[PDB]
Design a protein around this ligand. Structure first.
Ligand SMILES: CO[C@H]1/C=C/O[C@@]2(C)Oc3c(C)c(O)c4c(O)c(c(/C=N/N5CCN(C)CC5)c(O)c4c3C2=O)NC(=O)/C(C)=C\C=C\[C@H](C)[C@H](O)[C@@H](C)[C@@H](O)[C@@H](C)[C@H](OC(C)=O)[C@@H]1C
Ligand SMILES: [Mg+2]
Ligand SMILES: [Mg+2]
Lengths: 102, 402, 69, 22, 1340, 50
């Protein structure tokens, strides 16, 4: 709240609005925390938010899944076992055991 | 889930669910404090409104989401929509292994194939290319295959012809109406970013060339390959399901060729002479001796299957022109010469294909249709047809009639 | 009429598609109606073989397995 | 009357404005 | 004839002389905004006017008033160029002087103190570019003019459809510019109803009561009075002899001692004549006729003081007695006629629930705001605030004018709110139309259609800002402390600023300037829209308004409209059209007095043109300008016929004025079907510029005007001689007559160089003049993209042959020779803007450092030490433009990955690679790099170098100005010194700086040297301040978004030529898609051996009726002939005499044309340059409807040496044999639209996926898959394909499991599917189960 | 209209004839663009009932 208040007088007095480090000197704290404080203060945006064309296209429809795993990778996982498991049978029985252990 | 710039975004249900919890919890608290009736009553009503807004919003006040005028979407609105459900309604889910681009002609194609851009086929068949590359041992493992096609090494092009060969692709246009809006073709690798489409099918798709775009789909499962080949294939639907007339009927350029081919003027080079057979008829025309249209008797061999499942043969001297004589070389077997002896307008040229199907069956009709297209375009090009300003003749009596 | 006759469909999952979703779900949920699939529209939603064409062999063979033992 | 809307009226069974009686 | 006309002149066919030349095409856009922002000492539209409305603002009753003095516009923070790169808005500060007066408590009003607060800042309002565009965020945007229903009253029908009983209805609607709607309407029972806005219907009379009108005055206002006298006994009556028309006698009618008519004889012209001439005032009537007659006023019994009958009540034979014995002599009744004057209003009162003013006021307030309890002050207050409040209601001037005009009043200007006289008057007129006298208007007429524009619209939004701040302003002056706060602490910025920002930023009328092409631009800035706020919607209207109207002539173009969802909802402005004084559309006309055609122009609005009889643009007059024929085709009122010699009041100015700039550029338009003509002018706007700006070989004559009026070119400010010519700049030395006395001067034009457009095309200017060439004011200095020598070239004309070629042209397909791509003429240059953002994440900050895990030196070659690609390094797909890395720590890898790093010994970094790399397949050269940095983060090495570089480059530019400028100034000082003390050789010896000392003898020349001194020293300082400011703008840390530390924008210049799949079309509506690119060997060639560039299919010509494309071809061939011919005699070097002779012959062409020509031109130096420019072809001008004719075309072909048929014999380049029949060959102008094949093409195997529902979604620009629809599903259902359909909606898309289980099988070599359940349906289960509905999957 | 188009495309059309021709074109395009929607709606109802 204190931040909103300062920008008001300083809004027309400066004629534009105070720079990101301006309210920083006005405020007690380390003054770089303004950026941090400014982030968490924002309210999240509705994922159902209509965007472009109004075509029921909604913001949430454009948010991709980053925690999934693409098959072009998953394919290489199933392969890498067959690779390393084969190459460990080419060694002595203790080297496979010692390498599988470490 | 987070977004760029460190801001967050969330579904409207949360705003709704949160509310229902708070109010509910508050009521629970308000029970242990022994509040007056007028309050706990008001709190219950407030809870009732919140649950209703959660389930289906808009049946009371249409509660609005925080800081945003637009009413928050409730659980009933997630199912509901336009129309009914969003899931199956147009449209209708995005699908992998697909693509699209501007389409062009490709008259050289047989009716069962289509021109496919090199890059499109590369990105589309990517898993097949990977698997075939390591089936023959050109790539150590699947990863190395990825780097290979990403490097576009010269060796990969031959491997693609293998996975492409017998493997139909589905072609679709934007306004799908009848079942012919999607048809299967055999891919033909083509340099360039444009899709080439057999002209005879351009009628079935109702696809002009004014910049219309078409979509490609890859039939992954084995059952889809055989479904595509035995059902959705181009050659297996030549006839409209709406009416038995062939929909593969030659369209415009081809038919202007055949009209100009079998036609006759009054006086032209070679008029009146006689030739042993259609073979030496072409020899007369191509050498420049005889005009395409001149009245001539030539020996022809026609066929009639009028025996019991058995083809009879008959030969005669037919009175015809040079163009009609040359064209007979294409007509397979049991069709009579009467069918090609006319002027061959667009109307006659369709009933030709129809009779050919109802007599010789499917296979002979397909290969027949191809030849008709090829010869139509070719001879139409020879004809040198054009349109000038002096080609439009105004009546001399117009001013008087007015 | 065509638009009126299409209204009545045994499968409620089919009706919930092109009709008003809310009313269909309610009106069906009270009676405990049990949708047996058997149709096209519903089978497309659930994502299995269409009970026609290539799939007609499958569904037929399954339909007889039902109400048996 | 006639046209595409005429088809829709037919398939919709709609009773005409001033019908006859049988 | 001008100087750039001496370079090339276009041969102009056509007869009709041009009396008026095309005005500035950007007029509307520029003029409008010019009226808005300006200091106007009066109520004319502008910031001044919008201020005077809401001002002065006084507090609530407190006698603390704040008034408004004046405003000013501060200098722009950034100029147009600087504002675009950074991304801010191009705007000026609004500084407004305010005066705060405070009245003494409680006093006769006088001020204790008044503090005049100097210019409190509120908002920055955007500014319009010299070309009429706005920059909102670094992006040029245009605000389209709007077409809406003009304010006033309008009487409509709504016949037919209502109630299906016929009978029609008649309704009136009062639509103010601001404030609530007042609607009046009838019903099938002829009861008048009223509704405010679209709200509940209410009985009309309730408003008169709200105006404080009792029933007695309602009957007295709308009805006449039938006077009844009780004289002797039983009812005599006053008779107006006209009242008996259209009615039959009700009793024995006799007066004046003579019985004129008995009972049952209808009253015709006979009865009325007798009574009028015999002067019969009073007759005796029976007591039963009043059984139906409604008593007019109230009548009470004097004795009992009780009400005998209320007003508007039907009298009876018994009622007359009870009011008769009370001593009542007079009873007033209504005059009612079911034909002339209807008893309508009377029946409305019986449905009126109210009685008095408060009752009506209550019922109105409860109508508008129902459910809430009515209050006396509330009902009174609301009704006074609706139509009577100066704040919430205005019709403004145009509304009042049309209001008064439609009511047949005198005053054209009046109050801006509604008055009791106004509402009452409208009702009377509506009733008059229902009575059969008078007619109804129509919404579609262009006199009732008003045109707004940027200036007016911005004023409305700014008005909204002042009202939403007004509530605030009164609120603060409520509690204010005395002389501490000032008219600053109260008024904020954001409230006013957000009103104007919300408009330009996201308003339906504010949109991206369509800029790939000058015609697209200029046709956007002239555009009309009935959509947006205050307009209709696509779904609501309505074929009547979309359709072309007779009033569209000369105002709106009939043939230029979109062919999409909204047809006729846009149109475009005509060529000569102008916005009327009141805001209507008026067009130029020529006043024809008596029988002579006079050249005085007169602008007539839509209603003005109505009564006059107007002649036709094509008519034949001569000498004094008398109509040759005794009768000529004309249109007078809504219809066209032959009109007599002297009747006609006016005549059309030009043959073009019906169409628009777009349609006016199609040659031989009169020969093309309107459908294909639309498409032509629709597609002509999509033509991408070309590499070599060519010229149209066949043309109209507008292209010169279109080129200049659009800002793409550079026009001479003042005439003179060019001092310096560079591909960068142009310096002109001014002529003395045009030069200002002080400061001397030269005009320096800084040319735009290669840069990105909105559509990702290239916009680049080239100098069209040579060192030391005379140019006069209004001469073309430099061409823009797609402009040639001052004309408009949107493409390149080429040799085309019509003939089927082996099916490669099948539908519209185009077969293009290899010659075209080799000449690189149809090549196009695209400039794409790619960005790299270094953001801040919760895991840590992102580095632009060049250290990227797991990449070789070949990757890092093209990058500098800092990680940014060098300028000029040519790149292809996959190369790294900007190295970027984002922190992700402690990956927590797995056993086999851990062994892998162990064997090959790589330290897997704590940083992940985000670097921006060139998208797959697109390839170009890096022409630029920008680095924006947050203020306070240290600029890296490269970032500092660029800024330092910009400093040096900036300093050089300003210095260049000063050097040429100083010489230009000192060169004038040299000349004035020579006048009176001339020393030529002596003066230029000593240092030039040491000149300012020499004075002069008494004369004005002493004061002239004085003048140049003053302005000189200013330059020293103007340069200084300009240099300083420029330097600071470089060094200032650029402001970024929250969370973004720095941004690197790379500009790639891709050169794409042409390949199969691109769309191409002529101006005549013939589209095409290049099919094959054929070798020159296979191209049809003529006997002379010159191949043909393009082979078109003739079959497209007959079906789609566009015949101009053929004429354009024919004439084109002829044009090229004159070129080839000249090309031979110039390569022959005959001489100027022989050449000159031949050229003159061409420009005459046999008789009666308007072109004129030489040998006024200097016979040697001027003529020879012209011939060199014609050798490519001879430019010809075909006016729109005045264009050339067959005979002239055939005649020009004779001079060409080419056949009359326009067809020749061609030989196939393959077999070499001839082609039967002649074929048409010629030169067609052809455009390359940007639908280019390597944009549209997309393919995806396995991409990203949407989170909410797992479905293919492009995040990398490897675009999500094609959308498979319901109709497409049916297509699969008709075929027997079950498995294709399952795989389509399950494994290929929606199944989060099945997709991976499949992919693994595809590489394994097993084609199968393990389908599972699509995740879409699996979510629907949870949503249903989330409700109280239990949905289970039963059985097995 | 009781005054037909007396000219044709091989000759020129004057101002009036073209202006009168415009309505036919625009109404043609509009009708088809609407008839496009009508067709689709029809197929919808039809395939739904079968
Ligand atoms: C703020 O305005 C927006 C929405 C208003 O909402 C809404 C409801 O009110 C509208 C108004 C008031 C219009 O005057 C309008 C319009 O004039 C137009 C199209 C139809 N456009 N087409 C759409 C694309 N398509 C493939 C071809 C046909 C529209 O839909 C609208 C439109 C609306 O729909 N068309 C044309 O004028 C012609 C024939 C050519 C246009 C040229 C270019 C292409 C456009 O100007 C591009 C540069 C943008 O300018 C628009 C996209 C605007 O978007 C933005 C971001 O700037 C849009 C008008
Ligand atoms: Mg076609
Ligand atoms: Mg098309």
């Amino acid at each position: 709240n204190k931040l909103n208040r300062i920008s008001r007088q300083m809004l027309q007095e400066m004629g534009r609005e105070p720079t990101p480090e301006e309210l920083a000197e006005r405020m007690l704290m380390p003054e770089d925390k303004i950026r941090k404080v400014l982030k968490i203060a924002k309210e999240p945006i509705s994922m159902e938010t209509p965007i472009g064309d109004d075509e029921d296209s909604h913001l949430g429809d454009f948010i991709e899944d980053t925690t999934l795993e693409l098959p072009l990778d998953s394919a290489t996982t199933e392969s890498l076992r067959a690779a390393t498991h084969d190459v460990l049978a080419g060694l002595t029985a203790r080297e496979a055991k010692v390498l599988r252990m470490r | 889930v987070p977004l760029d710039g460190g801001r967050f975004a969330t579904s409207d249900l949360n705003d709704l669910y949160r509310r229902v919890i708070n109010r509910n919890n508050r009521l629970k608290r308000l029970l242990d404090l022994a509040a007056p009736d007028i309050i706990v009553r008001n709190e219950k009503r407030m809870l009732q409104e919140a649950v209703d807004a959660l389930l289906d919003n808009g049946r009371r006040g249409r509660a609005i989401t925080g800081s945003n005028k637009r009413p928050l979407k409730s659980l009933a609105d997630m199912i509901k929509g336009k129309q009914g459900r969003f899931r199956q309604n147009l449209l209708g889910k995005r699908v992998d292994y697909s693509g699209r681009s501007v389409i062009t002609v490709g008259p050289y194609l047989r009716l069962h194939q289509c021109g496919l851009p090199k890059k499109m086929a590369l990105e589309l068949f990517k898993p097949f290319i990977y698997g075939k590359l390591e089936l023959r041992g050109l790539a150590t493992t699947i990863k190395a295959a990825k780097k290979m096609v990403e490097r576009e090494e010269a060796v990969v092009w031959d491997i693609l012809d293998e996975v492409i060969r017998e493997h139909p692709v589905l072609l679709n246009r934007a306004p799908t109406l009848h079942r012919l809006g999607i048809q299967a073709f055999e891919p033909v690798l083509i340099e360039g970013k444009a899709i080439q489409l057999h002209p005879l099918v351009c009628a079935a798709y109702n696809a002009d060339f004014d910049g219309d775009q078409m979509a490609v789909h890859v039939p992954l499962t084995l059952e889809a390959q055989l479904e595509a080949r035995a059902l959705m294939m181009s050659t297996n639907n030549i006839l409209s399901p709406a009416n038995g007339e062939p929909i593969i009927v030659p369209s415009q350029d081809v038919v202007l060729g055949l009209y100009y081919m079998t036609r006759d003027c009054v006086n032209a080079k070679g008029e009146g002479m006689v030739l042993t057979g259609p073979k030496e008829a072409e020899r007369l025309y191509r050498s420049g001796l005889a005009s395409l249209h001149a009245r001539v008797k030539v020996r022809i061999t026609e066929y009639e299957k009028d025996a019991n499942g058995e083809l009879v043969a008959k030969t005669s001297l037919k009175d015809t022109t040079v163009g009609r004589a040359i064209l007979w070389m294409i007509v397979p077997k049991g069709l009579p010469y009467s069918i090609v002896n006319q002027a061959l307008g667009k109307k006659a040229i369709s009933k030709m294909l129809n009779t050919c199907y109802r007599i010789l069956g499917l296979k002979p009709t397909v290969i027949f249709a191809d030849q008709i297209m090829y010869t139509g375009f070719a001879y139409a090009a020879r004809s040198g047809a054009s349109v000038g300003i002096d080609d439009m003749v105004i009546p001399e009596k117009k001013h008087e009639i007015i | 009429g065509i638009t009126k006759a299409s209204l009545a469909t045994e499968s409620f999952i089919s009706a919930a598609s092109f009709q008003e979703t809310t009313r269909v779900l309610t009106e069906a949920a009270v009676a405990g109606k049990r949708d047996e699939l058997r149709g096209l529209k519903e089978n497309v939603i659930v994502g299995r073989l269409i009970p026609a064409g290539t799939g007609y062999a499958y569904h037929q063979d399954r339909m007889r397995r039902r109400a048996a033992g | 009357t006639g046209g595409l809307p005429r088809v829709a009226d037919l398939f919709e069974a709609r009773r005409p404005k001033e019908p006859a009686i049988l | 004839y001008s100087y750039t006309e001496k370079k090339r002149i276009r041969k102009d066919f056509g007869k009709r002389p041009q009396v008026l030349d095309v005005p500035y095409l950007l007029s509307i856009q520029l003029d409008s905004f010019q009226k808005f922002i300006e200091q106007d000492p009066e109520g004319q539209y502008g910031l001044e006017a919008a201020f005077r409305s809401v001002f002065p603002i006084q507090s609530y009753s407190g006698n603390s008033e704040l008034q408004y003095v004046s405003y000013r516009l501060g200098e722009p923070v950034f100029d147009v160029q600087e504002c675009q790169i950074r991304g801010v808005t191009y705007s000026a500060p609004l500084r407004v002087k305010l005066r705060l007066v405070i009245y003494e408590r409680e006093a006769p009003e006088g001020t204790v103190k008044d503090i005049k607060e100097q210019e409190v800042y509120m908002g920055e309002i955007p500014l319009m570019t010299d070309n009429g565009t706005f920059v909102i965020n670094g992006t040029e945007r245009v605000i389209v003019s709007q077409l809406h229903r003009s304010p006033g009253v309008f009487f409509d029908s709504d016949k037919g459809k209502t109630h299906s009983s016929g009978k029609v209805l008649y309704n009136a609607r009062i639509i103010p510019y601001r404030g609530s709607w007042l609607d009046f309407e009838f019903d099938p029972k002829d009861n008048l109803f009223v509704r405010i806005d679209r709200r509940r219907k209410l009985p009309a009379t309730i408003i008169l009561r709200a105006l404080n009108y009792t029933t007695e005055q309602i009957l007295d206002l709308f009805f006449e009075k039938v006077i009844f006298e009780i004289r002797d006994n039983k009812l005599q009556m006053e008779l107006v002899p006209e009242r008996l028309r259209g009615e039959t006698a009700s009793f024995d009618i006799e007066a004046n001692g003579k019985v004129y008519v008995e009972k049952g004889r209808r009253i015709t012209a006979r009865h009325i004549r007798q009574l009028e001439k015999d002067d019969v005032k009073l007759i005796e009537v029976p007591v039963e006729y009043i059984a139906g007659k409604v008593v007019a006023k109230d009548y009470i019994d004097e004795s009992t003081g009780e009400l005998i009958c209320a007003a508007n009540m039907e009298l009876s034979l018994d009622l007359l007695a009870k009011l008769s014995q009370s001593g009542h002599k007079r009873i007033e009744t209504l005059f009612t006629n079911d034909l002339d004057h209807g008893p309508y209003i009377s029946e409305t009162l019986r449905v009126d629930p109210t009685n008095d003013r408060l009752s009506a006021l209550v019922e109105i307030y409860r109508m508008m705001r129902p459910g809430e309890p009515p209050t006396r002050e509330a009902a009174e207050s609301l009704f006074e605030n609706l139509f009577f409040s100066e704040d919430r209601y205005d019709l403004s001037a145009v509304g009042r004018m049309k209001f008064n005009r439609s009511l047949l009043r005198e005053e054209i200007e009046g109050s801006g709110i509604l008055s009791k006289d106004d509402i009452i008057d409208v009702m009377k007129k509506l009733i008059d139309i229902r009575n059969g006298k008078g007619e109804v208007d129509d919404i579609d007429h262009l006199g009732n259609r008003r045109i707004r524009s940027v200036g007016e619209m911005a004023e409305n939004q700014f008005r909204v800002g002042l009202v939403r701040v007004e509530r605030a302003v009164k609120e603060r002056l409520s509690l204010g402390d005395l002389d501490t706060l000032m008219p600053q602490d109260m008024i904020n910025a954001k409230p006013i600023s957000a009103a104007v920002k919300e408009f330009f930023g996201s308003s339906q009328l504010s949109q991206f300037m369509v800029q790939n092409n000058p015609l697209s631009e200029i046709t956007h800035k002239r555009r009309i829209s009935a959509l947006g706020p205050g307009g209709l919607t696509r779904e609501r209207a309505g074929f009547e308004v979309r359709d072309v109207h007779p009033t569209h002539y000369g105002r709106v173009c009939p043939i230029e409209t979109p062919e999409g969802p909204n047809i006729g909802l846009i149109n475009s402005l005509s060529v000569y059209a102008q916005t009327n004084e009141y805001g209507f559309l008026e067009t130029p006309y020529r006043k024809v007095t008596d029988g002579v055609v006079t050249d005085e122009i007169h602008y007539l609005s839509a209603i003005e043109e109505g009564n006059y009889v107007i002649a036709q643009a094509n008519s034949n007059l001569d000498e004094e300008g008398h109509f040759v024929e005794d009768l000529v085709t004309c249109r007078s009122k809504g219809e066209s016929s032959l009109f007599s010699r002297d009747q006609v009041d006016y005549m059309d100015v030009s043959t073009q004025q019906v169409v628009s700039v777009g349609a006016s550029l199609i040659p031989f338009l009169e020969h093309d079907d309107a459908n294909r003509a639309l498409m032509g002018a629709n597609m002509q706007r999509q033509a991408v510029p070309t590499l070599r700006a060519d010229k149209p070989l066949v043309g109209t004559g507008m292209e010169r005007a279109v080129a200049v009026d659009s800002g793409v070119t550079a026009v001479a400010k003042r005439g003179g001689v060019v001092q310096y010519v560079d591909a960068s700049r142009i310096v002109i030395k001014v002529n003395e007559d045009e030069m200002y006395p002080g400061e001397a001067g030269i005009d320096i034009y800084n040319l735009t160089k290669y840069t990105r457009s909105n559509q990702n095309t290239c916009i680049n200017q080239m100098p069209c003049v040579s060192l030391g060439e005379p140019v006069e004011r209004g001469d073309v200095l430099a061409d823009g993209p797609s402009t040639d020598l001052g004309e408009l070239a949107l493409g390149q004309n080429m040799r085309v042959a019509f003939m089927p070629w082996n099916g490669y042209n099948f539908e519209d397909s185009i077969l293009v020779s290899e010659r075209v791509v080799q000449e690189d003429r149809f090549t196009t240059i695209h400039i794409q803007e790619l960005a790299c953002v270094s953001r801040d994440t919760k895991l840590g900050p992102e580095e632009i450092t060049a250290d990227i895990p797991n990449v070789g030196e070949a990757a890092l070659s093209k990058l500098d030490e800092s990680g940014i690609v060098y300028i000029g390094a040519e790149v292809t797909g996959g190369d790294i433009l900007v190295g970027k890395v984002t922190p992700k720590g402690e990956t927590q890898l797995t056993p086999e990955e851990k062994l892998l790093r162990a064997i090959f010994g790589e330290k897997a970094s704590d940083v992940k690679d985000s670097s921006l790399r060139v998208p797959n397949g697109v390839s170009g050269t890096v022409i630029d790099v920008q680095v924006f940095t947050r203020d306070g983060v240290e600029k890296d090495k490269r970032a500092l170098e660029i800024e330092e570089m910009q400093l040096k480059q900036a300093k050089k530019d300003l210095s260049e100005e000063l050097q040429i400028l100083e010489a230009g100034l000192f060169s004038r000082i040299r000349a004035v010194l020579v006048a009176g003390g001339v020393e030529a050789e002596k003066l230029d010896k000593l240092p030039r700086d040491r000149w300012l000392e020499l004075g002069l003898t008494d004369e004005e020349k002493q004061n002239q040297l004085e003048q140049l001194a003053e302005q000189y020293d200013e330059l020293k300082h103007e340069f200084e301040k300009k240099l300083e400011a420029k330097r600071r703008k470089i060094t200032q840390g650029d402001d970024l978004a929250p969370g973004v530390l720095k941004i690197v924008k790379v500009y790639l210049a891709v050169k794409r030529r042409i390949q199969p799949g691109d769309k191409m079309a002529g101006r005549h509506g013939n589209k095409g898609v290049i099919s094959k690119i054929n070798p020159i060997e296979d191209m049809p060639y003529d006997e002379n051996g010159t191949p043909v560039d393009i082979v078109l299919n003739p079959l497209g010509v007959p079906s789609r009726m566009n015949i101009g494309q053929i004429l354009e071809t024919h004439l084109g061939m002829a044009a090229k002939g004159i070129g080839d011919k000249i090309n031979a005699m110039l390569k022959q070097q005959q001489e100027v005499a022989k050449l000159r002779e031949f050229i003159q012959r061409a420009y005459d062409l046999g008789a009666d044309v308007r072109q004129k020509v030489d040998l006024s031109t200097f016979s040697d130096e001027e003529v020879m340059r012209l011939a060199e420019n014609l050798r490519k072809g001879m430019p010809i001008a075909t006016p729109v409807f005045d264009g050339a004719k067959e005979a002239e075309i055939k005649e020009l072909l004779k001079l060409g040496d080419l056949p009359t048929s326009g067809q020749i014999r061609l030989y196939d380049g393959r077999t070499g044999e001839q082609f039967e029949r002649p074929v048409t060959v010629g030169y067609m102008y052809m455009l390359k639209l940007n639908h280019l094949v390597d944009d549209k093409m997309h393919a995806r195997s396995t991409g990203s996926y949407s989170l909410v529902t797992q479905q293919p979604l492009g995040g990398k620009a490897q675009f999500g898959g094609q959308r498979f629809g319901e109709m497409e599903v049916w297509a699969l259902e008709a075929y027997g394909a079950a498995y294709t359909l399952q795989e389509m909606l399950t494994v290929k898309s929606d199944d989060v499991n099945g997709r991976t289980k499949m992919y693994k099988n595809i590489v394994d070599g097993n084609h199968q599917m393990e389908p599972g359940m699509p995740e879409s349906f699996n979510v629907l289960l949870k949503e249903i189960r989330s409700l109280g509905i239990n949905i289970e999957l039963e059985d097995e | 209209i009781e005054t037909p188009i007396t000219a044709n495309f091989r000759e020129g059309l004057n101002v009036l004839q073209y202006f009168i021709s415009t309505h036919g074109a625009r109404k043609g395009l509009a009708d088809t663009a609407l008839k496009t929607a009508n067709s689709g709606y029809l197929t919808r109802r039809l395939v739904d009932v079968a």
